[PDB]
From a paper:
Hydroxynitrile lyases (HNLs) catalyze the enantioselective interconversion of cyanohydrins and aldehydes/ketones. HNLs occur in at least four protein folds; this paper focuses on HNLs with an α/β-hydrolase fold. This fold consists of eight β-strands connected by α-helices and contains a catalytic triad, typically Ser–His–Asp.
We report a 1.99 Å resolution crystal structure of HNL6V, an engineered variant of hydroxynitrile lyase from Hevea brasiliensis (HbHNL) containing seven amino-acid substitutions (T11G, E79H, C81L, H103V, N104A, G176S and K236M). Six of the seven substitutions replace residues in and around the active site with a corresponding residue from SABP2 (Thr11Gly, Glu79His, Cys81Leu, Asn104Ala, Gly176Ser and Lys236Met). The harvested crystal belonged to space group C2221, with unit-cell parameters a = 47.05, b = 106.38, c = 128.40 Å and one molecule per asymmetric unit. As this electron density near the catalytic serine Oγ remains unmodeled, this model should be considered a putative structure. Although HNL6V contains the Cys81Leu substitution, the side chain of the leucine still points in the same direction as the cysteine in HbHNL.
Numbering used by the authors: 3 to 257
């Protein structure tokens, strides 16, 4: 059996995994679904957070708490692929594999903002998404709150109204920390570069467009690619059984 650690994307929280966690547990696995900083029911506000690395603190702290010899399979969604890379550069030995589900896939050859800048060229219009600025640690940071119409049409395209309602209800303001990411030291070959990486995507994704998702595969070759037919960007909501099937096959492959 495996221990999966489920990692949401920006403006989201552990709650996006509410369908997938019971299914993985019904297969016998251990599952942790974290709220990152200022996300979900985390007490902090985004304006206290000055970088992706501080944003990732609950994942780093969880991994620090793993006793020696315990390995986990990280599963990230959307921007959560970046939290994976940060965690991997400190605790690569605790990571049996990383699975990127409709997610960004950073590399080691370019700066940590690389795949995010590519994402805004491929998808530059975020519809009713609002933006704001705050200063933390001397740097001006642009925060955002995903627009409800963007959520409806581009992320939750195929989700029922009861799932979409949770998003209107629970998504919170966040930030891409895009300028901070550009100046951060590169992810390292020895840490992040060394972990097994499995890339899960759908060409029906209406925000992480096929051009982007395919460019990422070409830019940084995963150890395994699964293409999910159908669904939408919220693959753990619209294709939950398929994702649990893929995760069982990763566990069977990577301990």
């Amino acid at each position: 059996f495996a221990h999966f650690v489920l990692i949401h994307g920006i403006c989201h929280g552990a709650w996006i995994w509410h369908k997938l966690k019971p299914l993985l547990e019904a297969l016998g696995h251990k599952v942790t679904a974290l709220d990152l900083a200022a996300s979900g029911v985390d007490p902090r506000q985004i304006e206290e957070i000055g970088s992706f690395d501080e944003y990732s603190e609950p994942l780093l702290t969880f991994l620090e708490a793993l006793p020696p010899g315990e390995k986990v399979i990280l599963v990230g969604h959307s921007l959560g692929g970046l939290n994976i890379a940060i965690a991997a550069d400190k605790y690569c030995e605790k990571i049996a594999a990383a699975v990127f589900v409709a997610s960004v896939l950073p590399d080691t050859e370019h700066c940590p903002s690389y795949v995010v800048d590519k994402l805004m060229e491929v998808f530059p219009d975020w519809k009713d998404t609002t933006y704001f600025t705050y200063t933390k640690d001397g740097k001006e940071i642009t925060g955002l709150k995903l627009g409800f119409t963007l959520l409806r049409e581009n992320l939750y395209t195929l989700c029922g109204p009861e799932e979409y309602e949770l998003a209107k209800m629970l998504t919170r303001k966040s930030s891409l920390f895009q300028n901070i990411l550009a100046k951060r030291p590169f992810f390292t070959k020895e840490g992040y570069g060394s972990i097994k990486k499995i890339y899960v995507w759908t060409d029906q994704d209406e925000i992480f467009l096929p051009e982007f998702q395919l460019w990422q595969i070409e830019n940084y070759k995963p150890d395994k690619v699964y293409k999910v037919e159908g669904g939408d960007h919220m693959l753990q909501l619209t294709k939950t059984k398929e994702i649990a099937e893929i995760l069982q096959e990763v566990a069977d492959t990577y301990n």
